Design a protein around this motif. Structure first.
Motif, mmCIF file in Angstrom:
data_model
loop_
_atom_site.group_PDB
_atom_site.id
_atom_site.type_symbol
_atom_site.label_atom_id
_atom_site.label_comp_id
_atom_site.label_asym_id
_atom_site.label_seq_id
_atom_site.Cartn_x
_atom_site.Cartn_y
_atom_site.Cartn_z
ATOM 1 N N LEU A 197 2.040 2.176 -3.406
ATOM 2 C CA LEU A 197 1.011 2.721 -4.278
ATOM 3 C C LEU A 197 0.713 4.177 -3.996
ATOM 4 C CD1 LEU A 197 -1.733 -0.022 -4.524
ATOM 5 C CD2 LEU A 197 -0.060 0.634 -6.207
ATOM 6 N N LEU A 198 1.316 4.765 -2.973
ATOM 7 C CA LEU A 198 1.057 6.156 -2.659
ATOM 8 C C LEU A 198 2.240 7.037 -3.008
ATOM 9 C CD1 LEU A 198 -0.939 5.471 0.524
ATOM 10 C CD2 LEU A 198 -1.733 5.859 -1.819
ATOM 11 N N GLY A 199 3.060 6.606 -3.957
ATOM 12 C CA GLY A 199 4.127 7.442 -4.443
ATOM 13 C C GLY A 199 5.316 7.550 -3.526
ATOM 14 N N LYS A 219 0.818 -1.200 0.000
ATOM 15 C CA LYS A 219 0.000 0.000 0.000
ATOM 16 C C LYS A 219 0.855 1.254 0.000
ATOM 17 C CE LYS A 219 -3.874 2.129 0.016
ATOM 18 N NZ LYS A 219 -4.800 2.079 1.170
#
Lengths: 348, 191, 195, 139, 109
Positions: C24-26, C21
């Motif tokens: 996926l948030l850069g 996760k």
RNA sequence: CCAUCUGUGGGAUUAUGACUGAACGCCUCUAAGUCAGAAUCCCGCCCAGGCGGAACGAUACGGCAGCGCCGCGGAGCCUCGGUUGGCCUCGGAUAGCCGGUCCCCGCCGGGGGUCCGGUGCGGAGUGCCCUUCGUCCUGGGAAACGGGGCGCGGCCGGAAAGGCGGCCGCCCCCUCGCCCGUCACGCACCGCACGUUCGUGGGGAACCUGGCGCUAAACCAUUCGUAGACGACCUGCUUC
RNA sequence: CGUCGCUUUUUGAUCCUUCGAUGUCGGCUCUUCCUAUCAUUGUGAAGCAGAAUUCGCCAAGCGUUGGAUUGUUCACCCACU
RNA sequence: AGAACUGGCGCUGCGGGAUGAACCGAACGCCGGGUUAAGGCGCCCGAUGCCGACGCUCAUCAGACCCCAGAAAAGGUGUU
């Protein structure tokens, strides 16, 4: 389904890319892994096979029915002029295998060496290492060349030695050195390295690395047979005579339901010029050939303790498609990979 | 059930004293030392008192299968305390048919080379765990004596002989050959 | 900018969920020393279900098909590839940030590592149950560079213990320095306001 | 090992729940994971708080086994817990922890100016202990 | 001198499981990790700042290669404390994983 | 195979066999713990080497070009992401860290007392720069390093990806680099968005521009045949 | 005497798909795969003295041929192993 | 293969059942807000990133959500 008569495999899946090797010299996949309890020595060595003759020996095998009797045995003799050590390379392992740490070349390098570093000797201006030999000579790089030994000694873990054949002593047309990189299995890695610091650009014969009756391995590149189809490449059976569209094929190259041709099945392609690694060849006779100039030329080879004639190992009128053996040689029991006039690398 | 607590009590005699770096137990006695670490078992060991050395291993809540292992703690500690004041003498007696088994010791009391078992050309090197001792008993035919402190390593040593001299592909009800253990005792007899 | 995950003492999926996760948030995560990653259950079960994975092989050429990696670097990596939508480009680019490393590399040894208490062996297993290492089963399957990483695990741990030698030496004096004079006029505003 | 237990009369801290931050006194245990607490002089009345809610201190008390509210009340203040809970180095930790959140923004400025002054003095004096550790061994 | 906003990565769109709604965003802003303490961030004016090749300047003076897309916080979203948002344009869908700028504007304090 | 030549050992274990030993005062190969263990399983040996990576060589003049490394500011084109960084114990979790004598490793680090701390305050819910408007005028506290740098040059440290870190010796120069205050000015742009960094970021093209250097090659035609369906490979060519 | 299942290597039951066609018996040729193991290794149990056989477990790595008749799958028979 | 009652697909999307004619919700102009249905809340994937509560269970083939996509007789000092 269910074949109704079991057949063994044709060919081996362990040699599956029946494909031209990427190379001409026999690359050694794995040198014998060094135990530093032994005195310092080499393992591998370059040599050109020439042809085959045969032999008669008194076999000595108590327990066999062959014993105490004359046997003819097939030998192959391999012309080995002495190498010249030029470079040292140290490796350090990583968690991703051995990585080439750094290299050190010779002070001055010979003429057939630089011919390997070019694809055309005529057009070139022969300029290799002409800006490398100044840092052995002028002092400016010379104190950081011994830096490169001091940092060699501490970090690197298995050292390997760049040496190559001498082509001036060989009757061929080629005149390019075959440059190699061969491993010293010496003692402590300072004294594994303090043996090769002694001996840049100095010749090394075969009778120091190898000896009489030492059983070696041969690594080399096979015959050039060409582009040959199924029943010749893999030795699958010929079809019966009545067969339309061909006698010489394999017929059923898969099932239906794997709707895709397997890799296991034999089909047409390129036969020969593969890389192979022969195991457990016995050396018979280390040869020395064609000594000093005072006795103006003594030949004296092919001399057992029982034939005893001032002979020479090359046959009566030279080997077929080779030339004429003038140098030190190695002779080995049996048949050995490769055509005549082709380099093959030996290995303990 | 998750019972509140369970506890055994272990007495230590005065010529042996036990120190711990945690769960690990270091025992030193008259005839040497031996140590066992219990880094996997999750139970506290509690030394208590001077002059007397009462050990009291106690386990809290636990499931019943982890309740069952606390008696295994006191039954392993009382084979180090006995193993460092007495030690274990293992008397294995060789039985043989028409072939007499002959046996030697080469390396200092640690290696055993067994020959002519049942009529083989093949000898058997039974190398022992480091820390035990070989002995061929005299004033007695074909008795082999094994000594040492640690009861695992002495019985591991005594098992590799009994399991090597095994008759295969035959009747093993009859054809009774082998080097069978007979008596596990003490070195200091009756002390 | 970058966060660094010390990998030992954790479980496999209970860590790799959290990384999947956060990538996926850069962000950019680097998992370091992924050899001591555990996995719940006893060892021989976790070796069966990886040999069961090795018999999966497409029967017309294996050179295309399931690429079975062996190093515990690329075992944790193929798990995280399982939990990102890699067939779309948003999941392709969520692998341009994760850079798993086995052992502790020299770009990433001199950073203060961060660990995950949400994934540890202490927290998440009940202590009476059996657990494997990702290291020693990868020794069992093909990753033949085990000891030459445990050779380098100590050679980093040797030079790290000599830093903690002299970090507390550069900390033992500033407790002796604050036993000196004329600072207590500025302790007055901090003892009142959470020193 | 296991230096402090649960017991009839163990003063326990309560970190969360609907009674976060205040102390209790364990009156009796009921079924392993829950227990009966009350506190006379800490405004939490008699109920069942679970053990994973709470938080153990060192202070034991002397109770009868599950006595009434009054017999907690005397032995509480005969022991005078809130004085003995005041000058400990753990209630100073929670009280410092709650000072810093309610710190007004001007008070953040006063800390910020007067923190670096003692940093620009300790760093400028522990550097001299580095100078004096090597002038010693300069011979 | 000084930064006057909050870092807030852009998590997705308000999606079902198959289809997604473009007309509302949702933001995980750095710092809040529960629904109890998202009450500060409600109604704050937030903005997605990015680059172009063309030059234009809204404020100040000289133009430049920077342009912005406005927006504002609508309401809370889930117990993890991320925040659904609602911009006056729809998002470029490049912004997944990138952050935006969430201001200290429209205060009720 | 119609002639000859050769064909390769390590590990974790299965089944079975035991050990130690409870459960259940014995017993029990198992509940924890260990041991032997094979044509199976994996690896080596053996074959190919990837939209993977090293080391090292050689880096283009003629008649005018041309090209590296270092010092350059001027302008233009394109790609965009970020808005302070933490410079590192090992591990344990039925346990742990601090400071500290006795007797040990070439004057440090190793083993035991003892003393602290402990829902971690020698506490990444922490820490340090810091939220630094700038400057002048002026007084008190802290200060004997000055600290940037074109520095000047030296030194060893860190190979698993060293691309990264300190010291010494001089130096245009600083004696205003911080806390508490005295005094007064700078766009005070008339309520309002993309401001504040990283960063004189990454890219490729060309002109005025200092100091240092740099004078190759590949491929093809030609030849060979250890090789080849054509490509590919193997080689040769000096005015001796 | 019973009774519980598995399996789709046997036929049958059904018509779901294909009638502007899916080339349909058997052999020859070649590859893979299953294990309900005949042989080989490890082993355990016998009405297992040895030999020779028989029962179960782990186990598909490697083997499981040469012919007479038949068009044959099958069947039968000699020979080997 | 054949029926009876009623519903449903055919003629019909959408949410959920990973995927599907027929199951479970629910029926459709185009839209902006709010809320739920059946379902779900490690990460793909929106949502438990709750200090969720109570007990059970360890497999060398674990188990894991109607139709629904693998099971029985019989047995166990494996454990309550």
């Amino acid at each position: 389904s269910h074949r109704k008569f079991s057949a063994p495999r044709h060919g081996s899946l362990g040699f599956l890319p029946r494909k031209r090797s990427s190379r001409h010299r026999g690359k050694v996949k794995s040198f014998p892994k060094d135990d530093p309890s032994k005195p310092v020595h080499l393992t591998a060595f370059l040599g050109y096979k020439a042809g085959m003759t045969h032999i008669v020996r008194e076999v000595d095998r108590p327990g066999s029915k062959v014993n105490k009797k004359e046997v003819v045995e097939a030998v192959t003799i391999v012309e080995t002029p002495p190498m010249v050590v030029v470079g040292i390379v140290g490796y350090v392992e990583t968690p991703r295998g051995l990585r080439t740490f750094k290299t050190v070349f010779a002070e001055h390098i010979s003429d057939e060496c630089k011919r390997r570093f070019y694809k055309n000797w005529h057009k070139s201006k022969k300029k290799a290492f002409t800006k490398y030999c100044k840092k052995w000579q002028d002092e400016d790089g010379k104190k950081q060349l011994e830096k490169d030994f001091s940092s060699m000694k501490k970090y690197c873990q298995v050292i390997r030695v760049i040496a190559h054949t001498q082509m001036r002593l060989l009757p061929l047309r080629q005149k390019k050195a075959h440059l190699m990189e061969i491993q010293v299995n010496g003692g402590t890695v300072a004294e594994k390295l303090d043996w090769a610091r002694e001996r840049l650009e100095q010749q090394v014969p075969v009778n120091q690395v190898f000896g009489q009756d030492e059983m070696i391995d041969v690594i080399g590149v096979t015959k050039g047979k060409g582009y040959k189809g199924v029943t010749s490449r893999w030795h699958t059976k010929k079809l019966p005579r009545k067969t339309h569209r061909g006698l010489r094929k394999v017929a059923c190259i898969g099932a239906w339901h794997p709707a895709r041709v397997a890799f296991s099945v034999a089909r047409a392609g390129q036969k020969g010029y593969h890389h192979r690694t022969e195991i457990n060849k016995k050396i018979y006779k280390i040869g020395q050939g064609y000594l000093i100039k005072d006795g103006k030329l003594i030949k004296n080879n092919a001399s057992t303790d029982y034939d005893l004639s001032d002979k020479s190992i090359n046959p009566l009128g030279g080997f077929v498609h080779y030339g004429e053996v003038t140098n030190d040689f190695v002779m080995l029991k049996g048949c050995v990979v490769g055509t005549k006039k082709r380099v093959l690398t030996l290995r303990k | 059930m998750k019972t509140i607590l369970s506890n055994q009590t272990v007495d230590i005699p005065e010529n042996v004293d036990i120190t711990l770096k945690g769960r690990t137990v270091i025992v030193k006695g008259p005839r040497g030392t031996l140590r066992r670490d219990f880094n996997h078992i999750n139970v506290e060991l509690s030394l208590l008192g001077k002059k007397k050395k009462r050990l009291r291993v106690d386990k809290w809540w636990g499931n019943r299968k982890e309740l069952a292992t606390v008696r295994t703690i006191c039954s392993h500690v009382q084979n180090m305390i006995k193993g460092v004041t007495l030690g274990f003498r293992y008397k294995m007696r060789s039985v043989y048919a028409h072939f007499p088994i002959n046996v030697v010791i080469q390396e200092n009391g640690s290696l055993v080379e067994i020959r002519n078992f049942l009529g083989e050309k093949y000898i058997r090197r039974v190398r022992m765990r480091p820390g035990v001792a070989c002995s061929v008993s005299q004033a007695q035919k074909d008795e082999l004596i094994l000594e040492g402190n640690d009861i695992e390593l002495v019985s591991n040593s005594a098992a590799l002989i009994q399991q090597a001299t095994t008759v295969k592909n035959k009747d093993i009800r009859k054809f009774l050959d082998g080097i069978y253990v007979s008596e596990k005792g003490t070195v200091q007899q009756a002390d | 900018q970058v966060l660094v995950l010390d990998g030992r003492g954790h479980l496999l999926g209970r860590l790799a969920a959290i990384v999947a996760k956060q990538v996926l948030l850069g962000r950019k995560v680097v998992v370091v020393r992924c050899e001591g990653i555990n996995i719940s259950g006893n060892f021989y079960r976790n070796k069966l279900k990886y040999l069961a994975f090795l018999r999966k092989r497409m029967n017309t050429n294996p050179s295309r098909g399931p690429y079975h990696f062996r190093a515990p670097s690329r075992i944790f990596w193929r798990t995280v590839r399982g939990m990102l939508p890699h067939k779309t480009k948003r999941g392709q680019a969520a692998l341009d940030r994760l850079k798993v490393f086995d052992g502790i590399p020299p770009p990433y040894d001199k950073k203060k590592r961060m660990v995950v208490p949400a994934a540890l062996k202490v927290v998440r297993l009940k202590p009476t149950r059996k657990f494997a290492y990702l290291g020693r089963l990868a020794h069992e399957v093909g990753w033949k560079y085990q000891a030459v990483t445990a050779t380098l695990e100590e050679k980093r741990k040797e030079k790290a213990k000599i830093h903690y030698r002299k970090k507390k030496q550069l900390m033992r004096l500033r407790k002796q320095a604050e036993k000196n004079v004329e600072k207590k006029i500025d302790k007055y505003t901090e003892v009142l306001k959470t020193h | 090992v296991f230096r402090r237990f649960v017991e009839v009369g163990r003063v326990a801290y309560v970190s969360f729940g609907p009674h976060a931050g205040k102390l209790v006194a364990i009156v009796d245990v009921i079924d392993q994971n829950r227990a009966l607490v009350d506190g006379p002089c800490t405004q939490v009345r008699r109920q069942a708080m679970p053990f994973k809610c709470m938080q153990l201190t060192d202070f034991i008390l002397k109770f009868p086994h599950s006595a009434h509210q009054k017999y907690v009340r005397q032995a509480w203040q005969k022991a005078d817990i809130n004085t003995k809970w005041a000058a400990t180095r753990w209630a100073k930790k929670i009280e410092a922890r709650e000072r810093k959140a309610k710190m007004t923004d001007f008070d953040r400025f006063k800390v910020m100016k007067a923190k670096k002054m003692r940093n620009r003095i300790i760093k400028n004096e522990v550097k001299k202990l580095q100078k004096a550790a090597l002038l010693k061994a300069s011979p | 001198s000084g930064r006057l906003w909050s870092k807030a990565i852009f998590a997705g769109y308000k999606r079902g499981l198959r289809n997604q709604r473009e007309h509302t965003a949702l933001l995980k802003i750095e710092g809040v990790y529960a629904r109890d303490e998202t009450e500060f961030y409600l109604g704050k004016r937030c903005a997605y700042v990015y680059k172009a090749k063309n030059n234009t300047v809204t404020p100040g003076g000289k133009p430049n290669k920077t342009r912005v897309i406005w927006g504002k916080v609508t309401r809370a979203h889930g117990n993890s404390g991320m925040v659904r948002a609602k911009f006056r344009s729809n998002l470029p869908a490049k912004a997944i994983g990138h952050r935006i700028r969430v201001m200290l504007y429209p205060s009720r304090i």
